[PDB]
């Protein structure tokens, strides 16, 4: 039997939990694999949809309510069927329990209907053409199960019964799993999978021993001097990264510390912090040229540059760009004085300070880029260092809004309201199952007006412009500091097995983290190698 060896997420030891909703504990395994969803958009194709356990959707009238046609012919995992109540009873769940909304997806449908056994509708709280998109980022659980389950918000789920193309857990240790076949799965003529073989990695160290004497299959972490270490240690060892979104330093603007709340709010600080970075010398270093450079104070990227109001761009680019004389005129001007002889500057209040910069424990390359940070900004007089927390306190810190700084980066769409939306609306700033996106509390009423309108008209042109209001607000008040445009980091061995995507086949993101929905699309294409005979 085919195992393929994966590796989503960092762990120093597995602990079984695979409910869906739960992305801030669960394995990495559930979504897509475990749970397949209605649809899966193919972001890097302009968002074409690939129709699963829905065989077509249909919006209404006015963009304010849409059906989805369930197929017919889908048997959960047990062996029960896979109907509309099951969406239906998913969708309720999570309007009752809006701590299992990690999407946002409840300020969008306000109510969800069974139009019958294979139908389903849901009505908008407001017009929004790309709400089926949104929809399909619930996941969908067995109602026979989950409706007589105690708490929802803490089962751990250690026997899933589930839609996807592998919900069997055969083997389960705390530094190894084995994630294999349903054997009820509706799609079970495409694949040609096996297994999921999961080992415990706890961080880019331990990681880069094992790929580099190619014990991996397909991962998506980050590999220093990839050529020199890992493409030459074996001809079966290949990668492709395609572009992807942004990353940043983002500032806490409810920073509760008085001096360092006085600096992060000030607009002339932030934009001083962001021209004394050196972003191209940080893609060099830290990513080995596996980036390109972000100089638009809205993030917007040059991906998306035919998205840019290229006045706006211009306008602020300055701010954007290496520029560290310039950044010690800035601080000069804005009054960030150096008062105690240390050499570094002070508030306009004349009080010391120094800025925590924060980066997940063992996600390196991002490490190493906030240590180059701290010496760049050293050189302008901005007294930093550099924290490196496990990823689940780096987390809570920013919903917390106990940080400084962070450098993130953003999950990366087809068009710019992936990255505009989860990072600056102010919704999302608030709720226990949110991301970090949106940490910074910095909150502008019109902002989230024109992130809300973005998809309420279909005139292309008329959207446009709503991106670029979007575009001049950010840029303005420099809300955070964008340093580059990031990759999707991407490796994948020849060795066992054969069909993955790459720059000769870009079928779409290859990468297999959770939060890529095309990596069940993925893994369908996947097939073993013949390297034995019978006798
Ligand atoms: C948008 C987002 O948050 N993506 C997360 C990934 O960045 C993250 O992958 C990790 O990225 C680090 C930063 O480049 C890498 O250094 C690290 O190797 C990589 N880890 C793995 C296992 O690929 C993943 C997993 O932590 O979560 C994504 O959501
Ligand atoms: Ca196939
Ligand atoms: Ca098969
Ligand atoms: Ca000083
Ligand atoms: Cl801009
Ligand atoms: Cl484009
Ligand atoms: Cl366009």
């Not at 799993?177 to 080992?199: F, H, K, M, S, T």
């Amino acid at each position: 039997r085919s195992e393929l060896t994966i590796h989503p997420k960092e762990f120093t030891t597995f602990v079984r939990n695979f409910n869906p909703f739960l992305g801030a504990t669960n394995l990495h395994t559930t979504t897509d694999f475990i749970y397949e969803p209605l649809v899966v958009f193919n972001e890097m194709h302009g968002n074409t949809p690939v129709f699963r356990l829905a065989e077509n959707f249909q919006m209404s009238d006015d963009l304010m309510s849409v059906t989805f046609d369930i197929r017919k012919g889908v048997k959960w995992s047990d062996g029960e069927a896979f109907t509309a109540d099951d969406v239906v009873y998913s969708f309720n769940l999570v309007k009752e329990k809006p701590e299992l909304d990690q999407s946002g997806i409840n300020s969008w449908v306000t109510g969800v209907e069974k139009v019958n056994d294979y139908q389903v509708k849901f009505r908008l709280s407001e017009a929004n053409s790309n709400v089926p998109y949104e929809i399909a980022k619930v996941p969908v659980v067995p109602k026979h199960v989950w409706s007589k389950v105690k708490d929802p918000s803490t089962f751990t789920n250690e026997n899933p019964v589930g839609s996807g193309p592998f919900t069997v857990i055969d083997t389960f240790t705390p530094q190894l799993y084995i994630q294999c076949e349903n054997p009820n799965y509706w799609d079970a003529a495409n694949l040609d999978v096996d297994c999921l073989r999961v080992p415990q990695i706890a961080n880019n160290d331990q990681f880069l021993g094992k790929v580099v004497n190619g014990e991996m299959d397909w991962t998506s972490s980050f590999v220093p001097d990839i050529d020199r270490t890992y493409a030459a240690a074996s001809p079966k060892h290949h990668y492709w990264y395609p572009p992807a979104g942004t990353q940043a330093f983002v500032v806490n603007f409810k920073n509760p510390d008085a001096a360092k709340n006085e600096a992060l709010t000030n607009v002339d600080f932030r934009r001083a912090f962001s021209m004394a970075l050196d972003r191209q010398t940080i893609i060099d270093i830290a990513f080995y040229g596996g980036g390109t450079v972000n100089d638009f104070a809205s993030g917007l990227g040059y991906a998306f540059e035919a998205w840019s109001d290229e006045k706006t761009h211009d306008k602020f680019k300055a701010y954007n760009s290496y520029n560290a004389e310039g950044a010690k005129k800035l601080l000069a001007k804005a009054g960030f004085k150096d008062v105690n002889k240390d050499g570094f500057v002070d508030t306009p209040s004349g009080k010391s300070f120094e800025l925590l910069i924060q980066s997940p424990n063992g996600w390196t390359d991002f490490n190493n880029t906030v240590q180059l940070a701290v010496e760049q900004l050293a050189e302008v007089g901005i007294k930093a260092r550099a924290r490196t927390p496990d990823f689940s306190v780096y987390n809570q810190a920013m919903l917390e809004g106990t940080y400084d700084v962070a450098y993130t980066n953003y999950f990366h769409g087809a068009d710019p309201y992936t990255y505009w939306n989860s990072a600056y609306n102010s919704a999302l700033q608030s709720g226990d199952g949110m991301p970090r996106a949106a940490m910074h509390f910095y909150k502008n009423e019109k902002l989230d007006g024109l992130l809300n309108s973005f998809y309420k008209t279909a005139d292309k042109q008329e959207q446009l412009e709503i991106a670029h209001g979007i575009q001049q607000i950010i840029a303005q008040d420099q809300v955070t500091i964008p340093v580059l445009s990031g990759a999707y980091m991407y490796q994948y061995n020849t060795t066992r097995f054969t069909g993955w995507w790459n720059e000769e086949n870009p079928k779409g993101r290859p990468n297999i983290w959770a939060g890529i929905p095309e990596r069940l699309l993925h893994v369908l294409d996947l097939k073993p190698v013949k390297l034995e005979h019978h006798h």
